[PDB]
Amino acid sequence: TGELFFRSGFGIGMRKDSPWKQQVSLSILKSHENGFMEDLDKTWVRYQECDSRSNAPATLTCENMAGVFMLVAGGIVAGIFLIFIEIAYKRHKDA
């Protein structure tokens, strides 16, 4: 998508009251404070496969490059078969 829509967040269940409450808050404090979050990016976030383009940097082109020059080389051997008998045209005519 284009940009963010109404950013917010979630996490483990928080309801009623628990000793886990202010504690757990401090746990988050360590979390972002430490890098085990940013570390976990490797576990999830930093893990990435599909690339990201904007324009179409297709400069490789080797497939379509073959998609012209390959059959063009078809035109090259077209004289291997053709210019053979053509080389035998005036020649064989005078042979």
Partner 1 sequence: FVIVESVDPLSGTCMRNTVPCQKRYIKKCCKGFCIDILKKISKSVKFTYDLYLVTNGKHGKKINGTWNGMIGEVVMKRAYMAVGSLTINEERSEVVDFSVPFIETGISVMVSRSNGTVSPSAFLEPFSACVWVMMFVMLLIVSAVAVFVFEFTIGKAIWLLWGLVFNNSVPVQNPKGTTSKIMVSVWAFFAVIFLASYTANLAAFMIQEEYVDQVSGLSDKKFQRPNDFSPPFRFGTVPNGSTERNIRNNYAEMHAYMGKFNQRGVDDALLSLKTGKLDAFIYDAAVLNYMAGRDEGCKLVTIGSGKVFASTGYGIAIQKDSGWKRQVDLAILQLFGDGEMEELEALWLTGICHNEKNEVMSSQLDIDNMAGVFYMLGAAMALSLITFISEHLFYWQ
Does residue 70 bind partner 1 (CB under 8 A)? yes
| Distance (Å, whole) CA 33 – CA 43 | 18
> From the centroid of its chain, how far is CA 94?
61
- Residue in 20, 21, 30, 36 binding partner 1, rule: CB under 8 A: 30
Residue 4, SS3 per DSSP: coil
Min CB(18)–partner 1 separation in Å: 16
Residue number, 27 or 50, with CB nearest to partner 1 = 27
Under the binding rule (CB under 8 A), the answer on residue 40 touching partner 1 is no
Residue 69 interacts with partner 1 (CB under 8 A): yes or no? yes
Chain-centre distance for alpha carbon 6: 29
How many residues are listed for the chain in this entry? Answer: 95
Query: By CB under 8 A, is residue 35 in contact with partner 1?
Result: yes
